[PDB]
Amino acid sequence: KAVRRARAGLKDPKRPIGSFIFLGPTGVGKTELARALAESMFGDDDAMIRVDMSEFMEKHAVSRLVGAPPGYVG
Amino acid sequence: NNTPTLDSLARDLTVIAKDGTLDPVIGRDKEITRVIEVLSRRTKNNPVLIGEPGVGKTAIAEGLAQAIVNNEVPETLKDKRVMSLDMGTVVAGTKYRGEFEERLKKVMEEIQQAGNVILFIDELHTLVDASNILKPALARGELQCIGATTLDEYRKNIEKDAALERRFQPVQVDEPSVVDTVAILKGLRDRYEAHHRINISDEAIEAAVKLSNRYVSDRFLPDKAIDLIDEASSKVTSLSEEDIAEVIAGWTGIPLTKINETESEKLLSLEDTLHERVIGQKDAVNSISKAVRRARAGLKDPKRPIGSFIFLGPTGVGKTELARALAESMFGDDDAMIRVDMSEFMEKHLTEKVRRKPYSVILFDEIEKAHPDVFNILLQVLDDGHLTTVDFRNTIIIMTSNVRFAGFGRKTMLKELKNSFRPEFLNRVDDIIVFHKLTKEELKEIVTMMVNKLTNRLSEQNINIIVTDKAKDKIAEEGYDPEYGARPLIRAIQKTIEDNLSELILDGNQIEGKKVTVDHDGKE
Amino acid sequence: IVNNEVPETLKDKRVMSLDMGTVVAGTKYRGEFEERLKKVMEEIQQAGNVILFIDELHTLSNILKPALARGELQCIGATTLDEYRKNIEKDAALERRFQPVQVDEPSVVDTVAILKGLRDRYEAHHRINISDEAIE
Numbered sequence: 002k003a004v005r006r007a008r009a010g011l012k013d014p015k016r017p018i019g020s021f022i023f024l025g026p027t028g029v030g031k032t033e034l035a036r037a038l039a040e041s042m043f044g045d046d047d048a049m050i051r052v053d054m055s056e057f058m059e060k061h062a063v064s065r066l067v068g069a070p071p072g073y074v075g
Numbered sequence: 076n077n078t079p080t081l082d083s084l085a086r087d088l089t090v091i092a093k094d095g096t097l098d099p100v101i102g103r104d105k106e107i108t109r110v111i112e113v114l115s116r117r118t119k120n121n122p123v124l125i126g127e128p129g130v131g132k133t134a135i136a137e138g139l140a141q142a143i144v145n146n147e148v149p150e151t152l153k154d155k156r157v158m159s160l161d162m163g164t165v166v167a168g169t170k171y172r173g174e175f176e177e178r179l180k181k182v183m184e185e186i187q188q189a190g191n192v193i194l195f196i197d198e199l200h201t202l203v204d205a206s207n208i209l210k211p212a213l214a215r216g217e218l219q220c221i222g223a224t225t226l227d228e229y230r231k232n233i234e235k236d237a238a239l240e241r242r243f244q245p246v247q248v249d250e251p252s253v254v255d256t257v258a259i260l261k262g263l264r265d266r267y268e269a270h271h272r273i274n275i276s277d278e279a280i281e282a283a284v285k286l287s288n289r290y291v292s293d294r295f296l297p298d299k300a301i302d303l304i305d306e307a308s309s310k311v312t313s314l315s316e317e318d319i320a321e322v323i324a325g326w327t328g329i330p331l332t333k334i335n336e337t338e339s340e341k342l343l344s345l346e347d348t349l350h351e352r353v354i355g356q357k358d359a360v361n362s363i364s365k366a367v368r369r370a371r372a373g374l375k376d377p378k379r380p381i382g383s384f385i386f387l388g389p390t391g392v393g394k395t396e397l398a399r400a401l402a403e404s405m406f407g408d409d410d411a412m413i414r415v416d417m418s419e420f421m422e423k424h425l426t427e428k429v430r431r432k433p434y435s436v437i438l439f440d441e442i443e444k445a446h447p448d449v450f451n452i453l454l455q456v457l458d459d460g461h462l463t464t465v466d467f468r469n470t471i472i473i474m475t476s477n478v479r480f481a482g483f484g485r486k487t488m489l490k491e492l493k494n495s496f497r498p499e500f501l502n503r504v505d506d507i508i509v510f511h512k513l514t515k516e517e518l519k520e521i522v523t524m525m526v527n528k529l530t531n532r533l534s535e536q537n538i539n540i541i542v543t544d545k546a547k548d549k550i551a552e553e554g555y556d557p558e559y560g561a562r563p564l565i566r567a568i569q570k571t572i573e574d575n576l577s578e579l580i581l582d583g584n585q586i587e588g589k590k591v592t593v594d595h596d597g598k599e
Numbered sequence: 600i601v602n603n604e605v606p607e608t609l610k611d612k613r614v615m616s617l618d619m620g621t622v623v624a625g626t627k628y629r630g631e632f633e634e635r636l637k638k639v640m641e642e643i644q645q646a647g648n649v650i651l652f653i654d655e656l657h658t659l660s661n662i663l664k665p666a667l668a669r670g671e672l673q674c675i676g677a678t679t680l681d682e683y684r685k686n687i688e689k690d691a692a693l694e695r696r697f698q699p700v701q702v703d704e705p706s707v708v709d710t711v712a713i714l715k716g717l718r719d720r721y722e723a724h725h726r727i728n729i730s731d732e733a734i735e
């Protein structure tokens with residue numbers, strides 16, 4: 002419904018197409034469903050942008066998302 | 076009519092096209108058409124051919140020159156010259172004011188007054204000093220350019236200045252497939268036969284393509300295959316795969332018999348070539364040979380790695396030398412082993428190595444000590460087969476490991492692995508291998524190996540070392556430890572030989588080929 | 600070449616060595632050097648049989664391009680890896696035309712063999728005998 006609402010031109014221009022939390026047990030399909038969506042949109046699983054939050058265990062890991070402040074390395 | 080300075084320092088491509096000497100350009104019709112439509116623009120009509128080195132970027136400009144001569148271009152281009160301007164000595168006086176801009180403006184005004192030049196500028200990124208001279212002429216439309224650069228150079232230089240992006244349009248040039256490279260070679264065949272006066276078989280073409288794709292990673296098709304077939308037909312009635320393999324042996328140093336052996340005969344002889352390098356560990360060698368045969372039988376998903384093995388045994392008793400034997404046998408060199416450094420995973424709080432060497436054994440030294448981020452990378456390699464692209468399907472993954480009774484007082488390690496690692500990851504290793512604590516006779520056969528590797532090495536100094544088996548036998552004590560064995564022996568061979576002979580012949584005597592016959596004195 | 604040991608496919612090739620000092624020697628004005636270069640390149644194009652040797656090649660693409668364009672100047676040269684890493688690798692128009700040949704560091708044995716050959720004319724210059732074992 003979100004994908005169709007986007008391509009139909011009804012999506013609010015200022016907001017992303019959709020944002021979803023997939024909550025459930027381990028090994029139930031909720032990463033595979035994202036992979037299948039990416040495949041259906043781009044023909045390949047590899048076009049997904051995958052962020053592994055387990056490495057972001059510290060607050061300063063946030064620099065990997067948005068960069069290092071002026072004067073800091075990288 | 077004429078452009079006297081430009082004609083001195085630019086290779087005229089369209090005249091070489093009319094002179095028939097230019098080689099054919101095959102299959103690049105999409106890229107040529109994209110260049111045509113970019114050139115027809117009114118404003119930013121300057122294509123940049125973006126692609127890896129050697130993929131055919133200049134061949135697009137030469138195909139354009141052919142299209143112009145062959146009247147295939149639209150009428151807007153029917154008469155334009157294509158001039159490959161070389162930067163090499165457009166810089167010539169790096170200190171003086173204006174000496175660069177002098178001859179640059181001279182070339183540019185010649186190109187202006189002869190308003191029918193298309194200029195090809197290879198390594199365009201090297202211009203970004205000149206940009207302030209080109210921007211006004213480009214804006215004025217007098218000069219029309221084809222650039223060529225790598226993608227990373229483009230991002231590093233041209234993308235950063237919006238005023239350059241406001242003048243140049245990117246055209247992606249990709250490395251052709253094996254099929255396209257074959258079609259290229261089959262076109263160029265006749266033109267190379269006319270030079271070498273040798274027949275070139277189709278099987279030699281496909282062999283050259285395959286072997287350039289499998290033994291020369293750091294270079295790209297078609298240039299690899301062209302270079303290979305050219306140097307082979309130089310080395311040579313007709314060309315054949317044996318000459319291709321000989322040239323690959325030249326470029327790699329790999330022995331020719333290792334190169335031209337089939338997959339099957341390679342993996343059949345495998346475990347003998349393992350046994351003779353490692354000594355002992357019969358169960359481990361049989362396990363790894365069984366597992367790799369099972370993988371290469373070809374039923375497994377061809378995107379997944381060839382193997383994934385955990386080594387449990389004590390210390391250094393044979394793990395690393397078995398990994399090096401596996402890399403030597405499966406892929407052709409000890410240099411086919413990559414030792415991963417775990418610091419890369421800590422550093423955020425390998426990929427560019429695999430890019431260079433995809434036929435390699437990947438060794439994880441003591442995976443227990445790694446950052447637990449390593450398991451994300453491991454799982455990603457072991458399930459998808461690719462990272463960022465870099466592809467692991469040809470690699471073998473080896474992960475090494477080393478996993479008091481307060482009282483009056485061969486299966487435990489299989490237990491303790493389960494709880495010492497993430498079991499969801501142990502669900503995905505292909506096999507688990509246990510190394511035994513080696514026997515004394517195996518250890519002294521190692522000593523016969525190392526003493527031979529010293530004797531023949533010393534023999535390069537004309538020092539014909541000779542040794543008595545019983546003397547080596549009675550150094551088998553000199554490093555037998557419950558913790559380790561294949562290491563302390565290395566601190567025995569130099570004391571028992573090198574320093575022993577440093578007392579016995581190097582001083583107070585003199586080195587001669589006779590008493591370097593080590594006779595057993597009854598003790599050592 | 601002079602032994603005619605080279606392939607029968609190129610016995611006619613003549614090897615010659617170009618020194619910039621000689622080419623500038625006695626030039627009296629600017630551009631005379633460059634035009635003497637251009638006319639010797641034209642003579643090279645007419646002859647077709649030449650092969651040109653250029654030591655200290657790193658002293659050199661464009662000014663000799665008119666005969667590197669198609670490769671009318673068949674070229675052989677020597678350089679150190681230092682004076683190769685920094686320049687000859689760093690011009691695509693050279694990497695399109697040159698091929699590096701590494702000349703190996705020789706063994707002790709080969710160096711004493713070449714010595715005990717070439718020794719005979721240094722004996723001549725000194726009028727002294729060289730012990731072959733003192734060489735080794």
Ligand SMILES: Nc1ncnc2c1ncn2[C@@H]1O[C@H](COP(=O)(O)OP(=O)(O)O)[C@@H](O)[C@H]1O
Pocket residue numbers: 026027028029030031032033034
């Ligand atoms: N409902 C399902 N349909 C199809 N395949 C599934 C389903 N649930 C799990 N799987 C399979 O098992 C794996 C499930 O991974 P997944 O459950 O997406 O990881 P997680 O949910 O723990 O992030 C995938 O390889 C997928 O093929």
Ligand SMILES: Nc1ncnc2c1ncn2[C@@H]1O[C@H](COP(=O)(O)OP(=O)(O)O)[C@@H](O)[C@H]1O
Pocket residue numbers: 098099100101102103128129130131132133134135197259263297298301691
């Ligand atoms: N379509 C093609 N037809 C014939 N030869 C080609 C083709 N594409 C590339 N080549 C060959 O590849 C070699 C390298 O050319 P190129 O990749 O343009 O060099 P560069 O690294 O400057 O881009 C040349 O010898 C060229 O003839």
